[PDB]
Write a protein that binds this ligand. Structure first.
Ligand code: IKU
Ligand code: MG
Ligand code: ZN
Length: 312
């Protein structure tokens, strides 16, 4: 049968946490299939169905600066690196579901936060009062799964199918960063007091939720030029949202105000200290082989400190 292969530099570097998928969009589908085949097997999905699904997912990501098809595939690769480094901790269904979840987790993102949809009074904010965009992302995933020829899970039983769609629903909802703070605290406390138990389903749910946050934030784990250039795309979205907040007659939060451009280096420090470093610290305690993500995050925090000292 038909293995996907990659050129040698990609074949070796795709295994590393800090891999950058590159600027050649037409190679991203192959990179993803390559990752499914090695983390899941050539038997997991019917190739023709998997390809149809991938191409429909791509079409349902928008041309926005950050929450785009490149972000989706980036987040899936960080998940591939976690899965491949913790071979024996994950079930066959988890292997199947989580790469799909990561590819789907921002489907049909418009470049605006849950908070902007609520203030604008977008219809999605009436349909979904909390985690607004994330319930939408999961809803788009089920839509694409039900297009003809797109059921990549057709070989699973009724109960296995329901289990995988539950793994995907929870992984996608967990990417709402408002939910992350509490999840990480519960995980920290369970780890410290020795109650953490990976046979407990609700414990696994929290661990998978944290892996989702880690994958979603993985721009902070890259080589510094990747980190720094991704930050430009992140603020390009945030600042457009700030502009829209000002059109509604509302002072945006600092993060989203382009007039506070100068404070970016200090905003990045708060972000690394409040979100990123604690995310990868807890992840590393639970899954020791994920330590390269924490080491790379720490390295990028030093680079933001250098930008503030005027050395970078
Ligand atoms: C790298 C990255 N990955 C994912 C996400 C969600 N984020 N979110 C951020 C923004 C962090 C931020 N910046 C600011 N600023 C910027 C200047 C004014 C004010 C101090 N505040 N905060 C809190 N950066 C990331
Ligand atoms: Mg999202
Ligand atoms: Zn995302």
């Amino acid at each position: 049968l038909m293995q996907f292969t990659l050129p040698v530099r990609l074949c070796k570097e795709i295994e590393l946490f800090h891999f950058d998928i590159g600027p050649f969009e037409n190679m991203w589908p192959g990179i993803f299939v390559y990752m499914v085949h090695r983390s899941c097997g050539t038997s997991c999905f019917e190739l023709e169905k998997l390809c149809r699904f991938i191409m429909s997912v791509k079409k349902n990501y928008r041309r926005v600066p950050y929450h785009n098809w490149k972000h989706a595939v980036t987040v899936a690769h960080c998940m591939y690196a976690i899965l491949q480094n913790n071979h024996t901790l994950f079930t066959d269904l988890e292997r199947k579901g989580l790469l799909i979840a990561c590819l789907c987790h921002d489907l049909d993102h418009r470049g605006f936060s849950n908070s902007y949809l609520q203030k604008f009074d977008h219809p999605l904010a009436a349909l979904y009062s909390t985690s607004t965009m994330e319930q939408h992302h999961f809803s788009q995933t089920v839509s694409i799964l039900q297009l003809e020829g797109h059921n990549i899970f057709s070989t699973l039983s009724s109960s296995e199918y329901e289990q995988v769609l539950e793994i995907i629903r929870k992984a996608i909802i967990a990417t709402d960063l408002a939910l992350y703070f509490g999840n990480r605290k519960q995980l920290e406390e369970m780890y410290q007091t020795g109650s953490l138990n990976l046979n407990n389903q609700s414990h696994r749910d929290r661990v998978i939720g944290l892996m989702m946050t880690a994958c979603d934030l993985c721009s902070v784990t890259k080589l510094w030029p990747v980190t720094k250039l991704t930050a430009n795309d992140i603020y390009a979205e945030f600042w457009a949202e700030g502009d829209e907040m000002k059109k509604l007659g509302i002072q945006p939060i600092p993060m989203m105000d382009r007039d506070k451009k100068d404070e970016v280096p200090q905003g990045q420090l708060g972000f690394y200290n409040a979100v990123a470093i604690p995310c990868y610290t807890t992840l590393t305690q639970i899954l020791p082989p994920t330590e390269p993500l924490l080491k790379a995050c720490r390295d990028n925090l030093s680079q933001w400190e250098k930008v503030i000292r005027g050395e970078e």
